Subunit: 147 residues, 5 copies
């Protein structure tokens, strides 16, 4: 129902755990193109080492160019230490801030799971639904509502 | 127990921003918020803007974007979050809550907390007035009117 | 030991669970008058629906009038959902913000208990100490130190 | 082995649980004087009712006078309700804020323990190391590095 | 990562508590940048603070006096008998994230929050573990470059 051919979307994704990132980035892109008439040349895809750099990657990017919506994609898996918990907390509050500070919609495409299986399942593998598809429509809608 | 009011706010302009995930619970709430304001607080239908966003995460940004274009006396953020298999529930709830509180304090506009953070669907519906529960949306409506008036 | 007859104090309390709120507001007021020589005319008592509106009730108020200290009073009880947890967090961080932003002392008179019994006990009922008295003295002292 | 004779330090401590506070404030002071050549007349010691007023006490103070470093000292013990949890969280984030906002180093001298015994042990009693000494050096070092 | 940054000025601020683990980390971060990213030794400032609490303030104070392209905050926090670990970790983490978003300078998270010494050392490359300091070095170089060009 929502078409956004004049929309410029930015996708910033971490590179840790690419087995799950790719399906997500891919689904987010295809859904916007095939279902929302977004033009491929209007979709910038940038990356950062890990999820911690996510907020900063987005902030730096929406300062140089102009986008209508941004999607932050990353995957965090609980480890042996308290790392997962603290990073997850920081990046989440961070993304929310970068969005409220700039006035640019920031779609939350961060997965915070207990194990690899859970991440892949939410990436569309092994019978699960690909959450990247949802983030794509979300970005399109927020972009339009922001004009 | 919650102590609402009998205040009248016919000149108030109210904004309601709700997510669309889990509409089975959202509708009753939104509807409750609206009826209570009209039938009990003399708020005029034309003065009630109802906008939506995909999910609860876009709730704060939706409100911020909207209270910048138009002028409202109070805002109500409605959404439903249910605990899943991952830590998703935990982190989103935390971000959105801190977020609503900020949009409110930054702008100076009252923001009523109409976000349900439950463990399962059943709990959500119950607080939506179904299966014998009390509709929390009615509560949010009187709170919105009251905060609207106290903000002059 | 401190006297503050020229002090103007603001009290904003939620209305949910008045069985506990009243004793607290009363203890805060009496303690200031009978023990700190604060004048009744100089004490503004306002209310809001619930604890969530507490930060905004205070921000709105200390912007229209001038107070030397404020007391935020509310009672939150753990329910069946994660509600209690998330609202508590937000109100606490929020009260702290309103106080640091404005420069006005904000006394924390917010009870975060597991049940009604605990709330009343800290309101001075059933053999407990009334915490509102404590908040009153805190308000006077902070008011004076703020000059 | 850092000397800071020209440093002006500020110490704001809460008054609740003085049995533990004193040893801490005293250790911080002694260490600075005896080991870092800090002048007694350049040390301001102020107090507030409780830990909640800690952030506001410091903000107010580093606005009237000029200090090179500040030390916030308080003791929080877990009780029967969730009070401990929420106040600890708010005070901690608050102290960190006052420090980043102003540009004045703020040393974290806040003990968040499960019981009185743990508080006293970290105050140097019953065979424990007095943490106030550590806070004193930290303050001196941060004061000098802030130039 | 085949990125080279010979014109980059990197800042490293590390706490001094628990040096047995800090050193391997700081060393790994520095060797990695130089040997693998052509970063010049004279363009790498290494500063320290007493503990992890002072980490955010140390970085803020430093990126205000000089100009850096990226900063790395290194420290080690270990769970104790009290709630200290929990609250400090929380504050420092949110703090580092803020110093970075406020200034516009990339801040790499080199803070280990572990349950015991063994876990820290293992992540510092000892006893058969991978040195995380290396990763932070590459990260710093990449963020530094993406923040310019």
């Amino acid at each position: 129902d929502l078409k956004g051919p004049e929309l410029r979307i930015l996708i910033v994704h971490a590179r840790w755990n690419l087995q799950a990132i790719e399906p997500l980035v891919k689904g987010a892109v295809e859904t916007m193109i095939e279902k929302h008439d977004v033009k491929l040349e209007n979709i910038d895809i940038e990356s950062v080492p890990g999820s911690w750099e996510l907020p900063q990657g987005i902030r730096a990017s929406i300062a140089r160019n102009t986008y209508d919506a941004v999607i932050g994609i990353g995957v965090l898996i609980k480890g042996s230490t308290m790392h997962f918990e603290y990073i997850s907390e920081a990046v989440v509050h961070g993304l929310m801030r970068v969005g409220l500070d700039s006035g640019v919609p920031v779609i939350f495409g961060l997965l915070t799971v207990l194990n690899e299986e859970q991440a892949l399942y939410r990436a569309g593998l092994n019978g699960g639904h690909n959450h990247g598809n949802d983030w794509g429509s979300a970005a399109v809608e927020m972009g339009l509502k922001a004009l």
